Structure formats: structure tokens, C-alpha cells
Amino acid sequence: AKNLATTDQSFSDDFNRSAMGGLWFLKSDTGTNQVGVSGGRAAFSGLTD
Amino acid sequence: TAFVTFPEMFCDWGFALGGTTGAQSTGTAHTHTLNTDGLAALQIQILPAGYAIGGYIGISDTTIVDTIAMKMYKETSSAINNVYLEVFREDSTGALTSVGSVDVSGQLTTASDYVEATLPAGVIVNAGERYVVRMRNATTVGNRVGVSVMKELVGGRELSIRTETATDSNKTFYTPSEVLTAQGVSVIMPWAMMAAKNLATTDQSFSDDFNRSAMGGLWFLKSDTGTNQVGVSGGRAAFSGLTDGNQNALYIRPTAGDKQWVEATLYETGIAASGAREGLLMHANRDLSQVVYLGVNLNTAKIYTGPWNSLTERASVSTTGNDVLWQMYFDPATAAYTVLKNGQASGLTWTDSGSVVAHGPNYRFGGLRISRATFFNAGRIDNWTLKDWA
Amino acid sequence: TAFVTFPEMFCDWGFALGGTTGAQSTGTAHTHTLNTDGLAALQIQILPA
Amino acid sequence: VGSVDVSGQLTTASDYVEATLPAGVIVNAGERYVVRMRNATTVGNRVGVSVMKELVGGRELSIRTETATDSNKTFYTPSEVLTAQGVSVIMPWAMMA
Description:
The structure is cut from a larger assembly and holds 4 copies of chain A.
Chain A: E1 35-38, E2 41-44
Antiparallel strand pairs in A: 1-2
């Protein structure tokens, strides 16, 4: 399949699940807490600055 | 989930030889008979300090890498250090860029054993790109390192890199010219692995509108009728056939954890005659050894436990107008099951004080159940859904 | 993306032999020792028009 | 989770033997399954199985039991599984379709 008519990939996430999941590489300056999903919305986990 | 330069089964196993050899170099002409005592497998390549060897790794499905592995050992028992395993991404131009490295000299063993090392941070990979797992071995003491490789045959594609100078071994950003030179120089091909040991597992959820022609391969069907199973008609599941008995459909795809939430709408259940039991199944074994079942008739709704052959009633409640979108879920914080009718509490709750229900990897399957008796099929079901509520 | 009758890694590479052969056809009875000099790989078939 | 008798359809020539399970068994990605050949015959004729030799120093993932009780076992324990893995020296070819 040497050459294909490549489509334009598109993705969407409602963030309406329990955990962040493996579909998101997380990197934070806190050290332990990353972007956490709560109440169906992403937010800053932890009380750190 | 991982990617290997060539299947690990070759490193783990070998082929038995057979047949007959050919002519001799000198002496009386004879041909020896091959047998199982001859083994075809990977070879071992010793390598001195300052010599780096690596192989290209394909990416099948995109994910996040966490660790890398190689099959190697040390020749002598002397102390060693400065043994590095690193990962290089190949750009469009073919240049190699370092995206991670790790010291593995501490955990090395004299015996030929796997070496698995965690990267400092995750490196996202995508299907279609190529990666190289390089072993550096820039030690100071001088003990050599033996890596398990498999011999390459000339005349084919060259996709292994090998560098001898200490400068090239310590290089962290190879240019295309140096990559081509290393590919030309290289004669072996090492065994390398890029793994996905730990992932942030999601809460898997599934749903089916039951709006197709056949039952489909996404449902394991088991019934006491013998021949007929849950059949889809008019876009709704139903008890196929005129026989008296029970039918169950189990979703092939399991959920993530013990937290379960199943929901479906009950249709044509207010016209039932007597004893028509149908509804949803949660915490179902693959072999249906023990299940938690929600049975709704035209009069009431009950919760059942146990194998499909014989069910035990745990709780019951008398309701009316049972043609709505029923839901029922399990909270492991209190180990309790709660049923919500049309978004209302409906006062249906069971508490497992005795822990009669076992929760584990083999008890995360849901499904649907119908029963038919006395020439009156139970209601039909639609909009089936299972998920892991937060 | 492609489909192959058997993995191309065999077509590109080979295996190193090891072990020991069996009895000989004639002469003094002996068994040779296998080493990395023996290569196990696919063969080449000639074919006329 | 499933057993089948394949003595009737066996042939002296080395040929594939395919047997249907009594009922379907759902499987999921990430789990592991073992296809065990028992051979608890009464006449005493031996059975030859096509295997592929394993090399030492690698992972052990084949099971081999010798005693009749072990062969007739239905629910193995982790200790017995480890002992069988250590004892085994061959790896058989098995398919689940």
C-alpha cells in the first residue's frame, strides 16, 4: 500500500469518564498530580501551585 | 502491548534440524545424517567497550512507551558500569534523535537473561515511524558485553546500526550520513523491545441500539430452549420461538473494574400476561456461574442472584408503568446495588452484607435476559448500555 | 501497510546453527560440531521459461 | 473451560486435528489460554505431537505433567503450574479458532 490518499484525522473527547486514561500523555510541574477528570470535566488535581 | 525487532519466540526457542549434509572438505566422501541434536536459533555476539549496536523497531499501533528491553549478559563476573540503553526516533530525513536513555549496568547478570529498564519519561510513539534501541557499553573497567543477535544475510535491506568509535558511541544526534555509514558497517541485528508495561486504563463503555438484522457476533447467546436464542426483530431484542424457557445474551467486551452501570429501556412489557421476567444482567461470569439479574414484570421488579439454572431472590419492589428506561448500578464504596427507574430512586436497593457476590477480573460482564412462559413472550428491549460510572 | 506470504524478516535474515550432527554415511564414525558458520534461511529456486 | 475427545478422528499420518468445543467460551485480549493434550488411553498406544524445541535461559511458558493424577487434574494451582513449567522441556503447537 505504498501510496494512499491520506485523510485528515480528527479526534474529540467529552472528558466524561472516570480517569484521564491512556489517550493523554500527562506532564506537570507538580511532580505527582496531573490533569484529572472530575465531574465530567478536566481540572487541576491537587492543591499545589 | 509492545514492539519487537523480530518475534521474541525466536529468542526463547529454536528449530530442530533435519536432512543430510553434503560433501566433505577432505578425507573419505560421506554425508552425515541430521537429527534433533542440531538446533537453529539466535547467536551471541561479544562486544568491547565503546562499541554501540542497535536495531530498527517498527511501530504497529500508537501508544506511550515506558520501558525497553534487550537480551544480553556480561562475559566475566568483574564489576561493570556505563552500560546504556537508549531510544532514537527516526525523522523524515532518516536522522536519529535521542528521546531517552537509561543505565542498565547495575541489573546485568552473567547468565543470558532479559534486561528491562524504565525510561526517565514516557515517549509518545505513532504507527508508521521507526525507532532504534541502542546499547552503548562505554564501560571503564573493560568487561565486554554479549548481546543475543541473529545473523543477517547479504543482498537484503540493511536496518541495523553499529558504531565503533567512542565519539560515535557517545553521540546523541546522528546525522543521515553517519546513519548510512553505520548501516553499511553493521553485520548483525540485535533483539530489542519497546514495551507498554503500565497504562492509565480507561473505563471501557459499550452500547447497542439493537437495530440490525441479526443478533451479531458481539453477543454470547445461551438459552434453555436448545435451538432458539435472543433474536432481533423490529429493532428490538426478543424471545425467538414459541418455546417456554429463558434466553440470555452476554456482551463479549468486559468492563474495566468492578464498578458497573447497566441501562436499557423496556418496551412492550405492559402487555405481559403472567410471570414475564426480563431485564438486564450485571456481574456475569464468562461461564454464567453467578450473575446479578434484574427482572421486571407488568407488576413488580426483583433482583436475583446466582447461576442461570436457579436464581435466588434478594429484593423485590412493587411498581407500575414498567415501560421506561431502567438503569441499575453498583457502588463498591458501600458494596450496594441501586436501581433507578426513569431517573427516579424507585426504592430498589440491595446491600451485600454477606458478600455473596464475588468481584474480580472474571466478573465484569453484562448482558440481557428474557423469559417466555404460557404462550406469552415478555417485553422487548432496546438501547442497551454498559459503562463504569465515576 | 502490506501483506506478505511469510514475514520479510526471513527473506532478509537467517539463523545461526548450533548443536551436533548424527552418524555418517561411511567411514570412521564421528559427529561434527555445529557453529555460527552454518546459516539456516530460505533457498533459491531456479526456473526456466 | 472446555474439553473434547479426539481419539476417533486421529490418523497415523501427521495431520491437523480440529475439534469443536461443547460450547463457546468468550476470550479477551491480554489473558492467556493453554491447550492441553491429555492422552489417558487404555490400550497403551503412544501419541506423537509436533513440538518446537525450547532453548535454556529464556521464559518458561509450556506445561508438561507425567503422573496420571496430574493429567486428570481439572483445576490446577499456581504451585503445580510452576512445577510443570519447570519440568517441561518442549513447547507444543496449538490453535484456538
